[PDB]
Amino acid sequence: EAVVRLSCLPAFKDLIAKVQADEQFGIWLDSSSPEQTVPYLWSEETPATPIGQAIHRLLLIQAFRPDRLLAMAHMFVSTNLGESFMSIMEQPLDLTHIVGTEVKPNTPVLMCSVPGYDASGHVEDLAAEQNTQITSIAIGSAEGFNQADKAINTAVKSGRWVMLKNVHLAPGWLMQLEKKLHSLQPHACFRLFLTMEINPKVPVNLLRAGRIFVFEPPPGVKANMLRTFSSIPVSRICKSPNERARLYFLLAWFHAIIQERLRYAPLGWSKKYEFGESDLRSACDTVDTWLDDTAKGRQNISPDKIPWSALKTLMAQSIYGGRVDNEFDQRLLNTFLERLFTTRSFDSEFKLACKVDGHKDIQMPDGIRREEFVQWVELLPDTQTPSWLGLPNNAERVLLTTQGVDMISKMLKMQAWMRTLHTTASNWLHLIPQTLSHLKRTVENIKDPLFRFFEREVKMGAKLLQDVRQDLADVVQVCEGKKKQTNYLRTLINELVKGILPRSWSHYTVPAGMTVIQWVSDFSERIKQLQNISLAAASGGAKELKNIHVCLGGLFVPEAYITATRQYVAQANSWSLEELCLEVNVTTSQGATLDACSFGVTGLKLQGATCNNNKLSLSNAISTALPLTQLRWVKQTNTEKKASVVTLPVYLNFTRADLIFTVDFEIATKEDPRSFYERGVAVLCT
């Protein structure tokens, strides 16, 4: 599809023959850095400037292997605005010159940090090297306001500097501080620092009137572990039985994992949990208390006598688990805790992470004191793949892809409308089907649950389709100015021109940050499916509804479809709903015959694994489409599931925010369910 879209450009009209003729394009696709060597594919009558070559290679990278786009993006700038443009940004921020010159005493210096980080260290160390004192003040308390007032008055009278930490808690007083600072400040050496967290409650005027400095925690497991070890005082680690030190290292390692997995929000943690410093401190206190309770004396205690169950339960249900809501994230956290916190962790053959880079393993250090663990932390290689955290290595690629499109969106967010609005609305009207009617509500065969469910679907779909078509016709009529324009239509046209889907159009669940074009395309697909449903119901009746390969992604409420299927299976053979359990069988044939209990579902996409003969196996490639899924409802036999099955969730869209149901899949004998749990294998409706 990307090649088809790109070939619309006149310079890429012969892209198809070019890609077919070339034989090194296949190996180029799988190269680690395709952006470094982009094959000459565009057709141009005259040689192009290096900027034009960069543009064409950027387009090709957007077409083939979009994950490297950001990297290619860098190259483009380096080929246009000069090399080493961002080189100064990589170098650590030398803001001593910024506080010396380029910053007036009137302008405050704001130090905004990503939540979970502190910025006072840099300014404090520069004060130490520049031998100027600062009256550091916390603004949490009520006396903090007056204390800051007297301190800033004294320093502006004398010529010293002031600090104000966590000023995001006092927005109105921050506005008052801006108003006060707008007055002339007699001294020139006076500098006001506002250490702060990135939070939208703060005044816009203060941000405009000051120099902002954004501070981030450096990515990397090594960096996070070093920060954790630096935060914890040495005396706490080097105290009590020596095993405590090792335990702390384990905790630190664990923390790093469950923090670095956060950057891969959809694949690895579902949501963006906090998992901040407070949870780490609580876990440290729990470990300290339980080690003190179990081992009364200072003597070393055997690894098997460590209260492993206490630590695991407390850090799975109280700390790090309180903010976890859905079952599967809790299961992943339990898997991590059981893998790490065990009596095996004190052996020399313990593996903190396996399968890293295919064959390499992160061997657990053989240490007893804090210093050896710190040295092992400092010796970690820089080449940290996501396989360290347990995720498949391609996840990073996916992440880059995401960043890529986000970047494009920003470029779109930062760039006579009647003609284009007309052409888009007319194209949508030609694309969106005209009308589907409620061919339903027959007195006979009302008892069929599928009939009622499809009645509700067809009703609300036709209703929302009529609403959308009416709004689009109104926009069409107004774009020529053939009729008046109202407030509702004003909001609709503003939301359309800004590219955000109208709120009055979203009557069903939608992925966050979805463009109107994708929304109307999915609308067309859903309307086509519902029209097919209505045609089948008209041709055959209620019986034909069962033998339909309905896609769950198109359906607006798939859980209602599952409920209706369960009711249909229960009604036939006269069973009750509690006794019916769901069994999934993956059939290769798209039109394989169904028995009295099998219902076909298409469009289900498996991520992180491949299925064959209803057996799963781990694979690097994502989005392995399932040919056809037969959902069967069989009478529950009241047996314990074998250890060779996994309970995989079925999310609805790629943003794993809403759960539809769960599927019991049998895995290959080589793998283990824990690896499935940690890699975030899942089924998606869309």
Partner: protein
Amino acid sequence: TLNVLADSVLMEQPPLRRRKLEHLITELVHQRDVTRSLIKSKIDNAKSFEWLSQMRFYFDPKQTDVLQQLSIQMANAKFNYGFEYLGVQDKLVQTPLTDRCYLTMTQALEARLGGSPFGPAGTGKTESVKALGHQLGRFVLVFNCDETFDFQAMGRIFVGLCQVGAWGCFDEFNRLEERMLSAVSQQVQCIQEALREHSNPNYDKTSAPITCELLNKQVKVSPDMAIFITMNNLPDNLKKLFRSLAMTKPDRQLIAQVMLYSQGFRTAEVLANKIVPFFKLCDEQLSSQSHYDFGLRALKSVLVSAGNVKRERIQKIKREIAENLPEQEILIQSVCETMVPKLVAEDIPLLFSLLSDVFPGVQYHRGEMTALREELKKVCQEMYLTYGDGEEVGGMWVEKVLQLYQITQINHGLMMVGPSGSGKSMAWRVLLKALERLEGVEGVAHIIDPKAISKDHLYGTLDPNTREWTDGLFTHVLRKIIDSVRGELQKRQWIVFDGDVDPEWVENLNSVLDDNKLLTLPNGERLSLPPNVRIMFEVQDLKYATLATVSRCGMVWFSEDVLSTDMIFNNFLARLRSIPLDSPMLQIQRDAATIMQPYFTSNGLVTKALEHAFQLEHIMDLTRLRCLGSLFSMLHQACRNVAQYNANHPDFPMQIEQLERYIQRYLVYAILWSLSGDSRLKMRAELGEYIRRITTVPLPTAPNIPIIDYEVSISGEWSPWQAKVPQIEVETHKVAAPDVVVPTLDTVRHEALLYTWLAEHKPLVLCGPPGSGKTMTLFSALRALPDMEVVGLNFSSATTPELLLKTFDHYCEYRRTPNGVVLAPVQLGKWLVLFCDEINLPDMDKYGTQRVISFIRQMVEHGGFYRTSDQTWVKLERIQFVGACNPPTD
């Protein structure tokens, strides 16, 4: 022990012992679950965490201090039982989610942090916090944030929590207003910082008291207090001081099983596995309405009702072991009795389909109630209504009446909801008179419009300086009932709140609708609702009422399906045959009713014409009762015309043949001018063609002039209106005068219609485009009559019933000599007609209603209104209303 308790609960016990038995059963079930699995899984050490995690109790009676006798330990957290008396509270079923909540909460409390059990509403976060507090024997206060919040009480409440050492739980912190939330967060941060410093490792031995800054003063903070913040994120002040916990999915399958086991059911597991998915299906498959509630609270109420039903069946069988009952049948019957009355008529087959799907082969049989179902028949026959059993005409309405009686017996504070035009008022009126004829207890009903009066007039006001309390309507009614100066006790008093419901005038009604049954007036007086008083809400849509008022009231939903068209036709024919329009008049009415009986059938001309007129386009929203009532009024006028003709011809009166022809032609004329009588000419013509196509009665043979332009003469023949249009020659000086009325086709047709609809004193609105002569025609018709006095009121956009009241003060007078106060015009024999142009123009309030319109509705439907001067019901006589307004689309 569990077997003994289960055997004992099956018998008859006093309610307090019943509650003790249920609490013991719940706790013993939790203990059995803990010991059977969580401790018998190869555990042999008293220090193993598999046992330390469970809530352990240690008793040391030798200790002198009472607070130190009992110690409650969970994980590494130790607490002392506060020994605060709790009365008899609801004990929570200890699901694994509840165990996790306990573990996390005591872990937070040990580290001197607060608890934040966030999650969707209805998962029991506040209930779990209260249960944890009661387990440790601590006073627990719940600060509801449903706009019942303030600073003045909250600050001193925090001071008290710090001092005495109680617990504080916020129901939903996120719902507070931003400044309120920020200030409360500041106070909570101060308290929690004090608590955190109370456990300094270097300052563990607290020598100086741990103090905190509240109310601009130092307050001692007791170590035993805590603050819990339930959410649905946390403020940036309290992020580092509170431990969060996700309470998203309560374990309903275990709660239902435990409670059904406590209720005495011997197959609680299967019933729970049926009833939890059944309520999920009820939430999902059924249509969405505001008043539905399928949460955990509704499930608990249904389960306790099922237990009560099973115990009553056991008692009935005993008075005539016994474990062979169909428990599933009892469960489904309880579900039906609790849920069917509040279901729309469309969802009832859906509910029964779901019940068949989940409970296969188990049927529900309603209570016969043949004792009262005969008094219902007698009362309905005496009111000229229609009564029927089951599938017969009248089954749905009588079943709704029975459901209303059931909910009346179950609890006070009833709510009858239904689209305008259903059998709501008649249902409870018939129920009241049937109860009074059956039980021998006189029934008195007070009809109050909450919107006819302001909140101050409804409830009373306190003088700002004099500090004198004067009671409003509802307060005076309650005081009169409770005082029993006449003997209103031993008589069923029903304070029915006809009208709509908004969260404004019911603010003081939440305290009485709930179990408190207490009305708290601002002056300080407190009124207790006597057991023989039921407060009814006869509302229409229930779209602007808060969930607090809805959940406190048992509900009956009156769909439009309940009142079928045959009911209306039978009632109209019975009233025509029995009630005179004033013996010869009654004979004329009976003959007319006999003539028109064939047309008023199930598939007669009138029903088909109605089903057609619904599909047409009308300037105002068509209501079945509006057109049906206008038709009934115009047939009454036809009977009056026959009587007048017979009076004008003492010899040779109306004959059966001529009367028959006249009545058949007048019926078609009335269908034309009643159905689609408020539409364009094209709609009237279309309806004329349609009625021509169906009917068999003769019609005007002219194929060019629409029948609407025709009329029916007293001789029984169709005659043109043009023949009745006179030719006038106005004076030269009076051309285009303000009051000149040149007769025309419209002027005479609408004149006849106005006379017809004013004979029955039915108020009417002449809705038409500006400039059409609505006011001119109306004034001409009104002042043409000699005994009619006209007063013109121009309803402005800020018009209030005070304008009306001033109108009756200026023109009418109050007279006490009848049974009640009577508001009558000063002139004798003169029917005061109140003109109201722009009647729809007065503005709707924030809750989608018009004050003056509701006032008019009350004074028209009931015949009078309550005056705020002394809170008495004045009755209107010799007063009519006539309206006019532009189309609503303007």
